[PDB]
Symmetry: D2
Subunit: 266 residues, 4 copies
Amino acid sequence: MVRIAVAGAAGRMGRNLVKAAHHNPVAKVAAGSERPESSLVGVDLGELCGEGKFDVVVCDDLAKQIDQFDVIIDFTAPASTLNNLALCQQYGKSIVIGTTGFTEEQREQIDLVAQQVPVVMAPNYSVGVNLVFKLLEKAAKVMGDYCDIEIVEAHHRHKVDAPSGTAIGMGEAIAGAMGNKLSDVAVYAREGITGERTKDEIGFATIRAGDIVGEHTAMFADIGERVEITHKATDRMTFANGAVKAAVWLHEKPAGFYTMTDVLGL
Amino acid sequence: MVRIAVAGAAGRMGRNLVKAAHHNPVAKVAAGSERPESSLVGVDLGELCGEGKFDVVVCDDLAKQIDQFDVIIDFTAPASTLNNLALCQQYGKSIVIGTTGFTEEQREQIDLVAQQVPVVMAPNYSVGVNLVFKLLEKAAKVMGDYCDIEIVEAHHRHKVDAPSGTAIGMGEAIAGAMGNKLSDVAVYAREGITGERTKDEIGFATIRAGDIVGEHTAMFADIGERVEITHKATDRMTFANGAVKAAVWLHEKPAGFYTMTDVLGL
Amino acid sequence: MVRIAVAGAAGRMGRNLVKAAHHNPVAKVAAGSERPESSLVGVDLGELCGEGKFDVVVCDDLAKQIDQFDVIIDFTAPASTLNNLALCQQYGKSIVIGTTGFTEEQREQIDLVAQQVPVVMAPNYSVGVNLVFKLLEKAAKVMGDYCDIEIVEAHHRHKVDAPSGTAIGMGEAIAGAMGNKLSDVAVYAREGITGERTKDEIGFATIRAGDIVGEHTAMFADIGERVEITHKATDRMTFANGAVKAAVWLHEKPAGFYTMTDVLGL
Amino acid sequence: MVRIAVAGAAGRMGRNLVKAAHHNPVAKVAAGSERPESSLVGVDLGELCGEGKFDVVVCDDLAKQIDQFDVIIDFTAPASTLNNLALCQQYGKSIVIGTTGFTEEQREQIDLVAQQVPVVMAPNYSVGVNLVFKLLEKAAKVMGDYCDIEIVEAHHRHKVDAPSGTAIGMGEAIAGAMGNKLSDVAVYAREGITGERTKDEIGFATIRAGDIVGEHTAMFADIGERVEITHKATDRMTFANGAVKAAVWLHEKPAGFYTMTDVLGL
Ligand SMILES: NC(=O)c1ccc[n+]([C@@H]2O[C@H](COP(=O)([O-])OP(=O)(O)OC[C@H]3O[C@@H](n4cnc5c(N)ncnc54)[C@H](O)[C@@H]3O)[C@@H](O)[C@H]2O)c1
Ligand SMILES: NC(=O)c1ccc[n+]([C@@H]2O[C@H](COP(=O)([O-])OP(=O)(O)OC[C@H]3O[C@@H](n4cnc5c(N)ncnc54)[C@H](O)[C@@H]3O)[C@@H](O)[C@H]2O)c1
Ligand SMILES: NC(=O)c1ccc[n+]([C@@H]2O[C@H](COP(=O)([O-])OP(=O)(O)OC[C@H]3O[C@@H](n4cnc5c(N)ncnc54)[C@H](O)[C@@H]3O)[C@@H](O)[C@H]2O)c1
Ligand SMILES: NC(=O)c1ccc[n+]([C@@H]2O[C@H](COP(=O)([O-])OP(=O)(O)OC[C@H]3O[C@@H](n4cnc5c(N)ncnc54)[C@H](O)[C@@H]3O)[C@@H](O)[C@H]2O)c1
Ligand SMILES: O=C(O)c1cccc(C(=O)O)n1
Ligand SMILES: O=C(O)c1cccc(C(=O)O)n1
Ligand SMILES: O=C(O)c1cccc(C(=O)O)n1
Ligand SMILES: O=C(O)c1cccc(C(=O)O)n1
């Protein structure tokens, strides 16, 4: 058994992660955090995910619960997650990171410190999206060189980053397979006269609406046909269960930067 | 019978308009134009749309064919179309305009001169899209005030303007029905940290790929459900037949700014 | 204030209906039922939807809790619902019916006993679907007479009836608006050689998969274009909230067969 | 250089195949057929596809033009195609078959006579669909064993067979990859009470409407997420170009049953 701390436990993901750890018999919910100013600091973890009393309460700092946990699962905010990564380095803990929208500098620090700390990081903990990355590699080898490639993503009205880190990851899987760098081909907007579409651009279209848990579509378009590779997420539990399984997988592994692709054996 | 000049007859629309006039028994293809530098100036109208020889050839200026035609059908480029509108004013001709991406000034000139010239103008000559405008009005009255409204459009790789004039028209039909001005609520891009979506913004997402003749979706999204009103165009003839029918409708009508909504009786 | 009994309270809808009633301040959760053989007979209503203890428990027969409630909300199974309708007739209670897949004979008994009992019945308690019915009427009047009409629906793997009662209701709204009877035109399957599609047929395609809460699409297809009117349900609460509102509306009303359309004022 | 006879040259595919062969510089259009009762017997091939006069006319029987061609490309009707296959066997010709909806017995005769005659056969001549088959194999290996698999297809109102041979081929690629037989798991209809969905079933939903050139979607659905692999055909030329390429490839090859997968090197 692996003992889990859930960072930002009152969050959309947080609540689902507590639920998911609770439902996995090889993983124990041992700690949860929230922002110091949060009105749910002191509330029982179970009462906040409709599972009843767990006998564990929300603290404002995981440093106060170091002896309770092996792995932090972090789907919060980038600054918050880097602090937790430092905490892991300091106390020989491991971390599963789901937070998206890191800057390049922040991401370099993660790559650096993952030499010291066991880390799983991914923009998507669903099986389906990790399969999709693989499908996109095959599709890009066969159609990429002559087709227009467009990435369409839809999320709920509270998502702050655009496009999704998953959309960016799909972009990267396609460009990588074609021997290109995404930044060389990405277009993130179109307004007014754009002129004609270049042949090699990867267009990103971003939808923000309602309670959409997440839709991603990669389109490979020729004159006369197109292949669309689509993933639809209908429940956050699809991410939470994956994250918990990543945590379990991660336990007692040595330092390294691991992806959900590694975890799943893809 | 109404005699038709087709402006920019070698264009994607142009070719289809010739075909469509030829197939309509109450409308006669009498003239066609192309750019002075065009290598298809002098070619027979029929040989360029797979209908065989029509006995009519492409000229570089419709002023040289004034006695041949009653109505110009213009799906070309904004400067070109305004010249044709001036030609109509000068010689008592009528015009059906399908060209999109006019500036505000250009559009003001059209509104002004349509007091003198019989004009049909619309961003979409399909029946389906003109129905959709009406559906969007009803949907906005019932759901608009509490839902997130997003407009997604997809066109072929050669379209120069973004978003489509149809997407803009849908935006305008929705905002109009809610007593708002589109410019007050439209968002045409999302990149980086956007923060949370405002309640009243109308987001536009633009896809450019392959030979897509055109897909438009208006989404009204609540927490737990969404209504999507979608139009898919699969053949340019859907626009061309509408335009020709507009031309026929327009013949001998007095000066005015008429829409495809007027033409169809919606 | 209206007091609600939730039939089949451990069900997918049931749980949501308990939660929705409990959260709505103008309605009270007073009773819940389950099948006599059910292992959750005797469990508290609140522990069934992650809301903690309500001080109300699940009985195997609502006749034993008759003084506790005014309105039954019934999303269970057709035989079960007819028994609850009889209970209403016997004890002067009202009923909101969401159960689908009644036979014609069963439905006749509902119509008949709704002369005595205040009844709301609908295949869909979402606002969105009730708007869609109205949109379908407009679309059918404009495009129905010359276009192919197809209805596509997708639901979760546990749904027992096909097509959905909503799909059937859409079919009925369209055929009604065209002066036809659905049973005259519906086609529910296509296998082997069908030949060409007839002009008048309304095709129904049924998808069963995963945890899809429900997608319905009505398609109006011409040669070259099509209009698709789509509703996507992402959370059962979209139905539960509507049902509770129906219950509140229904309280103290006289006998009659009322729809969600009546309740919403559409 | 390979000389091509196009069976059923006035057909939807036929016309496109003539056009495609004529435009491809490594292949020649030499012969075309139509039904003996056909009013376009005697018409020039070129006037049938807007390419002007080819100096070749439509015969009612390809046996009369046997010295004109090497390869028949046959997208007609199953009985008609079997007659052309017999003609190939009799006169040492080769055949590219696109016709769909053969019975098992008919298909056995194809398999058998392909030991004598060079044959390409496939339900889809698009590159995209041939890639999709490969993607379906990967998706089935990763998600097939625990997810619901559904296949949705949409075609134009004139298609006589259901589901599409492509839909069936997708079903076969998935079942094959899972060590199952399609006929053991396929469900082609759902009406009335079906009960719950079985674990193993592959559901097929068939849409018939308008001028849809063809949409196929394979869905792999878990509780909380789904992967959809979609192909959309927008122009018949996507099939015609593939078929012509198949014909060029097939020229001078020995007897055998070859697929589009062989031709493309997938
Ligand atoms: N990788 C994936 O599979 C996946 C899935 C879903 C979401 N996400 C990503 O996860 C992140 C979180 O998304 P969300 O919708 O759950 O957001 P949210 O705002 O609903 O939840 C984040 C929570 O973290 C808390 N938090 C912030 N700073 C903190 C600190 N210093 N200590 C403790 N708690 C803190 C917040 O109070 C909040 O409750 C985003 O970056 C999002 O893109 C990733
Ligand atoms: N309203 C509708 O229903 C509808 C439908 C389709 C396209 N459109 C719009 O119609 C316009 C044309 O689209 P397209 O794809 O056909 O573009 P296109 O570039 O394929 O065709 C336009 C043609 O007009 C010609 N042209 C330009 N200037 C000219 C001049 N001075 N005289 C004569 N010919 C001239 C060009 O040479 C070209 O052949 C665009 O603005 C597009 O958005 C509208
Ligand atoms: N009208 C709508 O808006 C709408 C929305 C969702 C579902 N539905 C329909 O509602 C019905 C239920 O759907 P569901 O997914 O919740 O099914 P479910 O099987 O998850 O729930 C039904 C519940 O009713 C219970 N039940 C059956 N017979 C009973 C009896 N005699 N006494 C007490 N309880 C009994 C079952 O034990 C079960 O817990 C279906 O017909 C479905 O199509 C309608
Ligand atoms: N494999 C693929 O990629 C692919 C692609 C498109 C269509 N198809 C299939 O190809 C077939 C044809 O499709 P279509 O839409 O072109 O149909 P269609 O009816 O438009 O065309 C078929 C033509 O064959 C002709 N024909 C029939 N019997 C004949 C005979 N004995 N001699 C000469 N001509 C004859 C018909 O008169 C007709 O003109 C169908 O089975 C369809 O499913 C396959
Ligand atoms: O890749 C991402 O950015 C992502 C993935 C899943 C969910 C979310 C989210 O809800 O923000 N974001
Ligand atoms: O509204 C538009 O901009 C529009 C409508 C139909 C076709 C096109 C096009 O092909 O550009 N553009
Ligand atoms: O119309 C229907 O049949 C329907 C509507 C909403 C949900 C469900 C369901 O979950 O079965 N069924
Ligand atoms: O697999 C098929 O059945 C198929 C594939 C492409 C086109 C068509 C068609 O037009 O019928 N049918």
